[PDB]
């Protein structure tokens, strides 16, 4: 299920050809506001533990905005998940 959640957020780097029509809202707002150079989501698993989260590369003057948008997406997945994005994931 957490993997499906990562599939909702997805990955992005600057060489992606989707433009502003990317299905991920984080990737779409990153392209629209020129915020990040790249981001990715990870679910690293070890024996009954692990790290679930996101890693992004960007310049300095965007960092806080990226964090804000990233956290918003997580809270949206905690509060307002719909069936269409779940099917896509």
């Amino acid at each position: 299920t957490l993997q499906v959640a990562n599939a909702i957020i997805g990955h992005y780097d600057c060489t992606y050809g989707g433009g502003v029509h990317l299905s991920s809202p984080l990737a779409s707002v990153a392209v629209a506001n020129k915020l990040c150079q790249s981001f990715q989501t990870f679910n690293i698993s070890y024996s009954d533990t692990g790290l679930l989260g996101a890693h992004f590369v960007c310049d300095a003057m965007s960092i806080d905005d990226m964090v804000f948008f990233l956290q918003g997406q997580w809270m949206r997945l905690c509060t307002s998940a719909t069936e269409s994005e779940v099917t896509r994931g």
């Binding site: 300095a60 003057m61 960092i63 806080d64």
Partner: protein
């Protein structure tokens, strides 16, 4: 113009922090608060206190000098 991102140029500095939910809000409050307060007051007491000490002495001297200024001089009404 002056916000986070363009304040200073810092190189090779590592900061470590923990969550406030992970650590105590009062970690050894009295046992390290008392010697730290004692150290601060012994580093500042000689600069701070003696002016207020001599204010207390001047205040007491002025009040008692006014009180004996209102006192009747016994040298008067002695000739007759």
């Amino acid at each position: 113009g002056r916000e986070f991102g363009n304040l200073a140029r810092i190189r090779h500095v590592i900061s470590y922090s923990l969550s406030p939910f992970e650590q105590r809000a009062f970690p050894s409050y009295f046992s390290k608060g008392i010697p730290n307060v004692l150290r601060r007051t012994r580093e500042r007491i000689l600069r701070v206190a003696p002016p207020f000490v001599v204010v207390y002495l001047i205040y007491t001297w002025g009040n008692q000098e006014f009180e004996q200024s209102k006192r009747k001089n016994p040298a008067m009404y002695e000739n007759d």
